[PDB]
Amino acid sequence: SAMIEARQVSELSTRIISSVQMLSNAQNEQERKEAGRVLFEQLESLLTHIKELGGESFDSKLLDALESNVQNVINNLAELGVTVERKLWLAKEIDTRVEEMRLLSEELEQLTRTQVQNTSTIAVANVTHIYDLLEANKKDQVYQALDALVEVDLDLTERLHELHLLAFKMLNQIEEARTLTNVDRIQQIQTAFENNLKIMKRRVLAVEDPTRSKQMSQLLTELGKRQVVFTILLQQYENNEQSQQLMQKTLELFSELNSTVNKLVDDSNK
């Protein structure tokens, strides 16, 4: 009757594994609740059988090595079931935190575009003015106007294009961040975002324009704060790594469990 349970165990062992894999590749807090809930029942069975088979022998050394193999297998499915739990949370967090950052970065991109825009209009307004000065033959004020056109407008038009270019890059980064799975890229974008943010923070402070500099410095310090989204972007990866090692562990444990349920199916042959 020990062979009756042994095979019964070897049989349920396989269905368990295919239930953990299933648990692993679960997506919402439903496919998780399921692939796991059945993982549960399948386990309570591996136990009833592992228990009965636990009577067909009384070898101290083996009965303990069995009690042990079953716990390890249980803690594993446990730690793994928690990982798939933590995964769903990280995804929820990241997707949330990113979008927050996007709305900000997008505001900043538009706020810098808006300024590039204004500089043009004003340059045109500024040139129109020169036509008047020129008419009235106020030749000095003309020279002075042309000076400003260069020392101020043409110079600002460039500084702002440059600034808007960064805000644009900084946005593109936040857009790629939400679906970043590759660890090296997460590494790269993180420090790139950190460096960009820094020069950006400095370029704005120098721009002589009250309300606008504050607006931007604010947006920047705010984005700077949600910068941690990158750390948690790593944990995502770090955790999926775990989730995979655990799975590979499950196999060694089930192998070890049976390599013992077998040594046990004997002794009842003595």
Partner: protein, 296 residues
Amino acid sequence: DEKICAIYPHLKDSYWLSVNYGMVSEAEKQGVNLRVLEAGGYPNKSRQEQQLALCTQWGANAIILGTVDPHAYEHNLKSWVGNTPVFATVNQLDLDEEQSTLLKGEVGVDWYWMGYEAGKYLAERHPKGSGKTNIALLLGPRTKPVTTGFYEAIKNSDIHIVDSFWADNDKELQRNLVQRVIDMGNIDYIVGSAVAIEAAISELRSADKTHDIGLVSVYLSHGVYRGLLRNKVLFAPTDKMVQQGRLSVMQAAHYLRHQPYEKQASPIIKPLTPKTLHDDTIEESLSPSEYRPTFS
């Protein structure tokens, strides 16, 4: 000092930069504490909603609002501003009877008349039987007042609208269309938005087609203005952008200070041609040169 919080759809063009100037200028003369906020642009509905709410938290005694969409806030205005007084500007802000409680004033212009004025210019230039004339219509985004009025003033005028192209109101988009028009080469005039005429000015120089295609703007801006000043444009109506800005502040100030004020004010559209740019007329339309966007 009373706190007035203005809110624009954006502040990236000659128009609103000019409205801004008047709002800021009057806000000074009127002796009130101004604070202006600009949405990201017309498609930024959410942003403006929060700005409306932000204006309230700031403790605005009165809120001037340039809707990002007419029918927005129609059944929500109070859930954003609460019980604060709102004065519409430039754009038509229509609200349901329950929400219309807050509307203490409106400043604007019927854009049908803007297009009409442009239409009339062309009509008198080419009356019935004086000789068929071909037009292109770059009026922007997709009935539209500007369009309707333009058509009404054309009715019975030997002027023919060959084709009509629409596209967002971005420079590079209009420029593209303008080029498309230059290629069909059987057109004599391009009636379009200020941004399109602006584009056409350069495009027509580049293609040397100047003197071959006339430009008529459906509204004013620095650029279209400077274009007029230098005979690179034929006509443009002005709806006094600077003045609309003042009027709105005046309303709001008067209301709070319990003074008399037209509940529905609106400047008087005025036609502009190179030989008729009257100083006092533009001073109430465009912001001065060098003047930069001010927010308080």
